[PDB]
């Protein structure tokens, strides 16, 4: 425990975390700079060693943080993310992984409380949304099957395959070129194609909007219930 607490006070120190954030911001600049072939032709040699240094320093940090937090480390999503992001960056350059190394810049999120809270807040709405996401995903699935069968023979790029139809249906949901780009061309062969995509557009837009309405209104319903118990307590007491 003597050796344990020595490490704990370092890993727990504000200098330690401020150092890591320093590295993250420095390496973030570096990774932008490595985007210029000009910059790489000259200073590229330096930035590569720096990225190797940062990676090793983050590996030492992850190791220390694990000795200090023990099993608690692997039950913490933030440090799980720090773990896998640093682990990715450790795969030898031997290819999409070289690109996924950029994800280590998200450590600026996992290391800054203001950023964690923002992400925690945004993520908190999702659990209640799961069943609606499942409903909408079943909806997409059923319509991707139908679209593949209706249109995939004449329009294989857009509908020749379940995956392609899934892609196009998502495009239609964002409303991107849905008419000039997909449905008008379809209607030159299938004049009733609009009977398929208009109702599809209605459901998916209607569901999106009503999802937002329900979150705002149900949130404020709770706010009211919480205020209601507070006022009713006082009137009963005083």
């Amino acid at each position: 425990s003597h050796m344990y607490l020595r490490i704990t006070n370092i890993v727990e120190s504000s200098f330690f975390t401020k150092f890591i954030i320093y590295l993250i911001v420095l390496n973030g600049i570096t990774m932008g700079l490595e985007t210029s072939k000009t910059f790489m032709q000259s200073f590229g040699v330096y930035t590569t060693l720096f990225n190797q240094i940062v990676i090793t320093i983050f590996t030492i940090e992850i190791i220390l943080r694990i000795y200090v937090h023990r099993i608690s480390f692997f039950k913490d999503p933030w440090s799980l993310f720090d773990f896998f992001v640093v682990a990715i960056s450790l795969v030898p350059t031997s290819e999409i992984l070289r690109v996924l190394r950029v994800l280590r810049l998200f450590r600026l999120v996992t290391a800054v409380p203001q950023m964690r809270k923002i992400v925690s807040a945004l993520i908190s709405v999702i659990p209640g949304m799961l069943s609606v996401i499942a409903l909408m995903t079943l909806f997409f699935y059923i319509f991707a099957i139908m679209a593949t069968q209706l249109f995939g023979e004449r329009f294989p790029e857009w509908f020749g395959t379940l995956g392609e139809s899934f892609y196009t249906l998502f495009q239609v949901m964002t409303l991107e070129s849905w008419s000039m780009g997909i449905v008008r061309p379809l209607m030159e062969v299938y004049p009733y194609a609009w009977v398929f995509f208009i109702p599809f557009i209605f459901v998916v837009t209607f569901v999106m909007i009503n999802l937002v309405v329900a979150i705002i209104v149900d949130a404020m319903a709770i706010l009211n219930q919480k205020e209601e118990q507070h006022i009713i307590d006082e009137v009963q007491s005083h």
Copy 2:
């Protein structure tokens, strides 16, 4: 009644409904798989018999459910949907019906309470919206007539027919290519076309947004009224 209750306990059992959901999920996978010509060339023979089996099993189920629920069955929208969806799947392969058979996968909605409640909730906002939908539909109708008369001679694909103008006006409402794709081309012949579509875009966007504003605010007004009676009861009593 002896024979009645025997069936009722089966049709009402959790195994019965869990079985049907099992079938729905299995058949849902099957229908995705039947999308691959590769898969069909090999295993296609099996999946066709399976779809025939599921269809017969669902027909037995609908029949049983009707003997158990009697007239209540046909006054229940969920089982009405199960009815017609299974009824569609019964039309002999002799063509758009073959595609509409996929709709039977929506039985996963009508059989899962979490999904029913979601759909019930989303549908509940619609009754209050009917008169606004009618207003907006009258609006579309009047503008489709005018557009057909103004533009249908020179731009028949987009406006040559009430139905075509209805289609294009919906496209303009989603804002999809409304300018580069429709109104700029129109303005090369009708320089004042923008006097028609800009105001059209204003009304339809303004109405959409204010529909959402009114639902949120009127919902919370009720929440307040309900909270108001509760607090006022206490102050009067205690």
Copy 3:
């Protein structure tokens, strides 16, 4: 007054207004039908006389309604609209007016209370919005001037004229083809064009959204204030 009240009871009768609505719906169908050249080649002779009849009947109605309501008629927006819409339909076929005759179908709005209330509600948010509309219109005006000066020489169709720039800026505000269709082409000559349109897009989207936020939140603030006085009255009294 003897002759006055005789007319008043007719013009005020439910049959009278139900008749007019009947005519409006009949003529609305007629105007859709007159959209088919096929239909016009055959039954066109009949529908033209019918439109002449409806127009005369509405003119008699407007006349009666004016004798009954006196100056109150011309201070009523609904009957002002009925007036001008019927007045338009009276201009001899000698051309855009022939099209504006379709607007008489909006009388189905001004004659049906459910529709009036809907329109009244939607319109009620506008007065409070006037100064923001003016702000945003000044904003459009300043940017249309700048855009004309920056881009109108090389891109006259999109920016050669204040009016054209106004049009394109509205297009950019709806986000329709703003990049692939306008700003990327502009940037082939003016690489810094994005410094103009991105901030423009930020302001206009930010203002729209915050307009909606402010209506919902200020509405509910009032709802709270109104609930607050009610509860505070009770606690003081009981």
Copy 4:
């Protein structure tokens, strides 16, 4: 102080500010008119002197306003804006500055209280949004780096440079031609490009919407807290 108060009563007078607003509106019309080459060929000589006069009058005004307000002037954002906008207009015609002179029309905002309040209100939501903007900007930055590395070699116009990728990613965020215009072309070379842009679209849309949800709900939570203390005070007192 004798000379000071003489100026103060003029600079503070309602005539003074009404005069300046008059000039702003007159010059605003002028600047629209100077947009027509026709108008400039004829009356152009007059409007140029008028713009020189207005500019000098505004410079006298800024000078007076500074003698009256002293250091308070340069701590006031509204008069800081009036300052720099008039200062821009003072740079000799020797080029983008000639265009930025139009910004002086925004003085109609800084001189009209109704407009100031509107702008103040809209701006007030921003401070609380800063950390989310930073989060989203870090997000854009990380994805612009990855996109440059994944796609910049084959698609240099859209992704060849951090700045270009930043631009395209903003375009994808507005949903403008994201599929037909960017991702489908990308997928002809990188079939898994959708694994990059779909999740990107999900995050950025999800964050936008939840930003709006959080402002409305947190605003009303405060409204409730404020109402809660008021009602609880009464029940305790009466």
